[PDB]
Amino acid sequence: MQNPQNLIWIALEMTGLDPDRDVIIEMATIVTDSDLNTLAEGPVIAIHQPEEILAGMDEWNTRQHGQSGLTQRVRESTVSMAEAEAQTLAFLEQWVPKRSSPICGNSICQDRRFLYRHMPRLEGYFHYRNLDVSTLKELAARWAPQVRESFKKGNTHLALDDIRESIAELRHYRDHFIKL
Amino acid sequence: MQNPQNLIWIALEMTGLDPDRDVIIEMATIVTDSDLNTLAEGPVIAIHQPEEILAGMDEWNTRQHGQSGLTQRVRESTVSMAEAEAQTLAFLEQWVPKRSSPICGNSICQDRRFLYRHMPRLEGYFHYRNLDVSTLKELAARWAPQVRESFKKGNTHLALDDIRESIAELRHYRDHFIKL
Ligand SMILES: Nc1nc2c(ncn2[C@@H]2O[C@H](COP(=O)(O)O)[C@@H](O)[C@H]2O)c(=O)[nH]1
């Protein structure tokens, strides 16, 4: 089912936002076609982390992941960082060829930073380009403010709705901000 | 002079692709207004690096920076990374207030990472938003290919020419790819 036009959408949770101090604890992927139609949904993987890493999280993160249950899921997981990377790679490979899709989503420079340090082979499977929806949001804010203020932010507390809300944010801009 | 909706455009040259292992050897900036009108061109600075750093560059960067003149300009530079940062901030300070502008250019996630590592005072001067022209390049190649070819890009290896082309690539999308 491969197709170099298909897009790889990704969302990550981390113990914090610094790739040197922090680690990935959840990953999720969704492959669309070039026109934002879902082809398939990757695994949502909580990635095992030892207790020292888990206790080493700052205050805001310790609360947010604990109350979400991600901490407990991460504590129980038998899937390592490398194993999750391979699981996501095994899935992405039947839909998108190597170095074809950019990373798609929101705030995905930070995602590329973490993939670079912690999953270098998955980072390498993307085209080096970034499809970041917030570029369009930033342009809409300046040049067509009504299109951005008209977007209906969804719930996104779970990883696949999070990605789907980003895909729907691109749709909104394709429909109301992009002459085609 | 200052105006919080002015945009800071930046292009770097590096010794390699790792923002943490490699270094910055050239930088330039251009300030436009929020409608892509060039307000001012910042200085083009070659940054001195020890000879070992230049000899250690891979094959592509040895070729490319050798034949552009940059390798020789690096060797002959007496401007350290920090002085190039202070010189660029001195210019940008006249045109954009602190934290107002995103970082604008092509694949500027790579640029921000190098700045974050090597020029964190300059990185901190940008709004946290990334204004990535190549996000639109990928959307245009997928949703309206013949506006992606309407755009004439001279293979411009002078730093300011690379930036002016980036500003012109976004102009071409505001006109032919975006509805306002
Ligand atoms: N190793 C390597 N680096 C590249 C390549 N293309 C661009 N770069 C890096 O990108 C920098 C310039 O960014 P650009 O303007 O090409 O986005 C160069 O200084 C170099 O470090 C490449 O094909 N191989």
- Concatenating the DSSP letter of every residue in B128-166 gives S-EEEHHHHHHHHHHH-HHHHSS-------SHHHHHHHH
Is A34 an interface residue toward B (CB < 8 Å)? yes
Q: Which helix (H) or strand (E) holds A46?
A: strand A45-46
Quote the CA–CA distance of B19 and B173 in Å, as a whole number: 29
- Six-digit token pair at A44? 């949502």
Max intra-chain CA distance, chain B: 51
Max intra-chain CA distance, chain A: 52
Q: Can you tell me whether residue A71 is helix, strand or coil?
A: helix
Atom of ligand 1 nearest to the CA of B107: 17
- Taking CA B171 as the corner, what is the angle to CA B165 and CA B135, rounded to the nearest 5 degrees? 80
Residues in chain A: 180
| Residue B128 annotated to the active site | yes
**Which of B5, B138, B143 shows the shortest C-beta gap to A129?**
B138
Q: Which helix (H) or strand (E) holds A113?
A: helix A108-118
Q: Which residues of A touch B137 (CB under 8 A)?
A: 129
Experimental method: X-ray
Quote the CA–CA distance of B173 and B170 in Å, as a whole number: 5
Nearest to B16 by CA among B24, B8, B7, B26: B24
Quote the CA–CA distance of B154 and B160 in Å, as a whole number: 13
- Selected residue of A109, A128, A136 to mutate for chain B interface (largest B Cβ count, 10 A): A109
What are the backbone angles phi and psi of residue A80, rounded to the nearest 5°? -85, 165
Residue A25: DSSP 8-state: E
Quote the CA–CA distance of A65 and A75 in Å, as a whole number: 11
Quote the CA–CA distance of A30 and A104 in Å, as a whole number: 10
**Cα–Cα separations (whole angstroms), residue A32 to A6, A44, A166, A170:** 6, 16, 12, 12
Report resolution in angstroms: 2.3
Q: Are strands A7-14 and A103-105 parallel, antiparallel or unpaired?
A: parallel
Q: In this structure, are residues B40 and B92 in contact, taking their beta carbons and an 8 Å threshold?
A: no
Quote the CA–CA distance of B126 and B128 in Å, as a whole number: 6
Between the CA of B17 and the centroid of ligand 1 the distance, in Å, is 7
Q: Can you tell me whether residue B104 is helix, strand or coil?
A: strand
What are the backbone angles phi and psi of residue B46, rounded to the nearest 5°? -85, 140
Is B135 an interface residue toward A (CB < 8 Å)? yes
Nearest to A9 by CA among A172, A137, A147, A162: A162
Nearest to B118 by CA among B83, B153, B152, B68: B83
Q: Choose which CATH entry (3.40.50.300, 3.30.420.10, 1.10.3720.10, 3.40.50.620) describes domain B7-177.
A: 3.30.420.10
Q: How far apart are the CA of B67 and the nearest CA of chain A, in angstroms?
A: 25
- Six-digit token pair at B14? 């590096």
